Structures are given as C-alpha cells and as structure tokens.
Design a protein around this ligand. Structure first.
Ligand code: SAH
Ligand code: SAH
Ligand code: CL
Ligand code: NI
Lengths: 318, 318
C-alpha cells in the first residue's frame, strides 16, 4: 500500500543512517563486494545483526548480494566516500537536532508562540546551537561547501566578477564561494562576514566577525547573500536587505543566490517545510523576493536560473 | 536520484505525522474537500504555514488540490478515521520512543552488549516504559487490535477452537483475540495473561495478572503466543517455551501466531530491524522456531500461513 509505505519509509532513512553513522559505508568503494563476517568482527558487532541489516538494505536497493559477497548498488555508490552530498546530508540532517524538532513541529503550528519547532526543543536558535556544538557546524559547513561547488561553473559564466573591485559575502561561513571565485578571478578585495568563534584563514581572503542585523560596511561594489534569506522570516529578511541598501552606493550590486520556490519542485517544498521547523523561515517565489526587496528600497534588475533548484537575483538601490 | 530520495524520504513521514498529530486529518473524511483558511482559523494555525505544509503533502500525493479546497487522495483516505492501521501506526511509531532510539541503533551494533538501542536511550526495557507512559500503551494496544482483526476470519476457518475447553492467551494484552474468538465460538473458558496496572473487563473473558517468565498455570488445553516471541532474543524466547512445555500436558496445544521471516519480504525485514532496535529480538524462520522449540522440548505438528505477513505454528509436548 502507498500510504503505509510513506509512513514507514522513515525506517529506510534510519537503516541508511546507521550503516553510515557506524562507519561501515566506507568499505564498499568502487563496486567492491564485501564479506560481512570480517566487517562484523572488524567493528566487534554481532554478525547475525549486521547480516539482517544488510538484508534490509538489499531489499530497498541500497546493496546487492552475490556469492562473492555484498556490494553497494551503482545508484547508491555515493555512501562510499565521506565527501558526497548524499553522505554529508546523512551526517548533517539525521540527528536529534532535526528529528526531535520534527516531533515538536505539530505543537509549534497549534501554539502560535513566535518560537520555531527547533527553538521549542533546544531553547536556543539553530545557529546559536552550532556555536555550542563544533561537531555539527563542521558537518553543516561541509554540506554547504558541496552546494556552492555545483553553482561555481555557471555562476562565473552568467555573472561578470571581473568588473568588481571590493566583494563582501554576508553570511558566507567558510568563504568557499569567495575562495572558488578568487581561484578564477584574482586582484580583487574579497571579504567574508559571518558569526565566528574563531576566524578562518585562506590566501587573499579577508574574514570579518560581524552580524548582518547591525549596519553593513560601505566601500564594497558587490554584496552577496547566498542561501541566507531562506533562514529568516519576512520581518528579519527585510532588516538584512535594509542594512544592505544603506551600505550600498548607486553603482553597487547585491547578489541573492537561493533555492527558488516553484509550483512543481517537491525538492524545494520539502526544504521549505524544513526551514519553517528550524528558523520559522521559508523558500520564496520571485514575487516574494520583489516584495521584501521593494520594502528594503531595493529593485530587481536581473533574474536567472543557475540550476534546476538554485537561481540568481541581481538587486540595486532605488 | 534514488539514494538522495531515500535519505530525505523521512521528511514525508514527518509531514504526514504533523498533519495527524495536530488533529487536522480528522476533517478529511468521505473524500470531503476542506478550506485551508478556516482549518487554520479553527486550531489557531497560521494560514501561510498550513498552506505550505498542504503544498508539500499535495506533492507526495497525500492531498489533492481544487478550487473547492483540498482533500485526501483516495490512496491516503485512511488518515481520516482514527481507527485505521495507517493512522494508528503514526500515533504508535512516530514519537521520541522509536526515533531517538533509531539514532542510537548504530551505537547498539558497534557495542556487542545485551542492551538494545531503546534500552540505551530510555535506560529501561520497551514494555517497562509503556507501564509508566499510559498514553502510548493505549495507542500500542489499539494498533495491535487492528493486526488481530485482519487475521480473525482466516484464523477461525483454519483452526478449530470448538475442540478446546480452557484457552489461555499468553501476553494477550486487551483480550481482542479472545474477545473476537468468543463471538463465533461461545461457552468456553477464555483467559488472558499479561502485565496489567489495572485489569480489563470483557464479558466471558478472564484476565490474569502474570509474567510468562514465571511458571505458567497448568490445566489449559490451548496456550496462545501471538506476536510475543518476536519481542524476545533466543535465550528469553526458549525460557517462555520452556515454561509453556512445563504447563502443557500430553493433550495440550501451543499456538504461535507471528510475522514469519521469508526471503523476499520488505515488510517483515523492516519490522525485523525494528525488533532488534527495540528489544534486541528478531522475526524467525520456520527452522529458527523449530530450533528454540526443540531446546524447549516442544515439537511442531502444524504450520500454515494465514495471510501474506502472518503465519500459524501448532506445537505439542513430545
Ligand atoms: N547574524 C548573522 N550575521 C552573519 N552571518 C550570519 C548571521 N546569522 C547566521 N549567519 C550565517 O549565515 C549562513 C547561513 S547558510 C550559509 C551558507 C553559505 N553562504 C554557502 O552557501 O556556502 C551561515 O554561515 C550562518 O552562520
Ligand atoms: N513478562 C511478560 N508476561 C506477560 N506478558 C508480557 C510480558 N512482557 C510483555 N508482555 C506483553 O506481551 C505483549 C506483546 S505484543 C502482543 C499483542 C497481542 N498478543 C495481540 O497481538 O493483539 C504486550 O501485551 C505486553 O504487555
Ligand atoms: Cl512472534
Ligand atoms: Ni492448515
């Protein structure tokens, strides 16, 4: 049955998580079939239990069985290396932080206390929690780093960075975007602004410890907000764009790179509900961006799709 | 692709859970279309948030959209009535008890101790927790009644209960199996043995406050163990069957009704890993049942499958 499958489909996610979290996933690199006995004994885990878990992973199409042993299906090869979008999603997402928050999401809808489902559980914010927990922030950074590297090739084609002198990335985190821009485009002043417990280091990249809810520095002709605004409700989103405009002069460009909400994109709509749970935020239509931008005294001069999911909005002062 | 869908598919479970847990699902009976803005108004929920959630539920095929409003898809109609196996699965399974314990499952593999993933999280056994938490036990027993009611018709056809005078249901919970058999087969001594805080009341049904790890009462010509042995590891399972044998005389019959482990079945494999997580237990093959029954000094006289998941095993002391 369709419905009962959807309800019990969480057990599949769990089974894949446990396989990864236990570190078993590494040993199935490049379609190498494996003997379970050695793996069970290697990790000091009961063979019977591991054999049964594999048997379940074989039925959902994660693994394949033979006389030689057990291998990852070509479709699920990504679980092998630990620096993959599928692997890094499991490491970042499948934890108490999301799963305990998901169980509080219904309570957060019924109770109209402004606080989000995550905040309800943890008593803090998402990003306030990541400052306390180093382990999860390294997983968060690593996953975000992958989503930037999908965009780079197209981003450099459709936008001219050669014409800019001083580039500031607001909520840049690692500064992966600017590091990857700096490889291709040299002889520019690159600055990353984000909440730092400790300042990152990279060749030719400046790192500012700042809060974009406070006044933004002047002198930069390029301001960037990549995957920031979908973490903030309208009132908080407008505040960020208001501080951006005041900092901007009439020749300055503001780049917004985000997941664009579309009628068909289930991928975006699943993240849209995820953003409501974590931050009481949302993914936005082109109209919703024009609304918050208009209130901030900014005007959309260029819109273009980078990817199936990611898009680029080019704003200016007016 | 497949892999990323499997990893993020848990978000679909969460969405359906929130729709049910918030008590919205009840207003979608008889394929009736409902207004989102009035639903939002009734439970004091924000229309924007509810509309976006409904948007996600429409995309996964739970809901259908119209000018009239939104309705549950014909395949997901079951979310309407609170007495559906799908609804009761959400109420029983989608909670901290399973999800927080699923996150510990990889720890409980890597550790080759006697404690299950649930025991590590809660510090108690699963059934010890249900004694403390009254709300979940009512939902647990409610789901169990449904799996009981799917089997009764074929169970009464294939097994003659009229030949037995005194029947004892070991771990019968609420006497749903004995209540449903007492309807069609009348004028018999029906007795249910289980861990009760307070004893249930049903006409013609007796309820003993007992532990099947202690010596089982003698003089019953039928003993039943329906969905009990899959909650226990071999050493504990053998102990229950040893107690049954000691209680049984040469004319006595033991009925085992269970989810039989079959080679190609995803439904049973998923429950098999769930049983390991909760109780460090498993679903068993016919050979595995014979093995623990042999060590328990019991002999399999009859085996028959009642449906696609549930089977029946008659055991006799010989
Ligand atoms: N008040 C604040 N000021 C600056 N940065 C902030 C902030 N609150 C959150 N952030 C940062 O905003 C970012 C949101 S997600 C960032 C992803 C990154 N730009 C990328 O695509 O690679 C995080 O780095 C978070 O730490
Ligand atoms: N030591 C023990 N002695 C007796 N019953 C026990 C027990 N430990 C657990 N149980 C009971 O075993 C049952 C497990 S599930 C059985 C449900 C029931 N046979 C049905 O299918 O409708 C629960 O009712 C639980 O309370
Ligand atoms: Cl069983
Ligand atoms: Ni038969």
């Amino acid at each position: 049955s369709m419905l009962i499958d959807l309800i019990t489909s969480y057990r599949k996610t769990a089974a894949i998580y446990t396989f990864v979290d236990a570190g078993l996933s590494i040993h199935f690199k490049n379609g190498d079939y494996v003997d379970i006995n050695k793996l069970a004994s290697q990790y000091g885990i009961d063979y019977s239990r591991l054999n049964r878990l594999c048997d379940f992973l074989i039925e959902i199409g994660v693994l394949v069985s033979s006389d030689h042993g057990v291998a990852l299906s070509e479709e699920c090869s990504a679980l092998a290396d630990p620096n993959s979008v599928e692997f890094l999603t499991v490491k970042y997402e499948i934890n108490s932080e999301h799963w305990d928050s998901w169980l509080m999401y219904p309570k957060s809808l019924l109770e109209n206390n402004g606080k989000s489902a995550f905040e309800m559980v943890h008593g803090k914010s998402f990003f306030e929690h990541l400052d306390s927990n180093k382990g999860l922030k390294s997983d968060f950074d690593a996953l975000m780093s992958k989503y930037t590297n999908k965009i780079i090739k197209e981003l450099l084609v459709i936008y001219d960075f050669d014409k800019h002198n001083r580039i500031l990335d607001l909520g840049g985190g690692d500064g992966e975007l600017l590091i990857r821009i700096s490889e291709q485009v040299k002889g520019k002043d690159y600055t990353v602004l984000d909440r730092y417990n400790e300042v990152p280091i990279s060749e030719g990249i400046n790192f500012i410890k700042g809060d974009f809810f406070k006044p933004i520095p002047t002198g930069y002709d390029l301001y960037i907000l990549k995957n920031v605004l979908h973490n903030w409700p309208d009132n908080d989103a407008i505040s960020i764009l208001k501080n951006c405009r005041e900092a901007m002069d009439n020749n300055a460009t503001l780049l917004i790179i985000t997941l664009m909400k579309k009628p068909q994109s289930l991928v975006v709509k699943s993240v849209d509900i995820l953003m409501d749970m974590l931050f009481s935020a949302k993914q936005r239509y082109l109209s919703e961006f024009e609304d918050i931008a208009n209130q901030a005294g900014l005007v959309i001069r260029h819109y273009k799709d980078l990817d199936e999911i990611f898009s680029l909005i080019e704003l200016k002062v007016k």
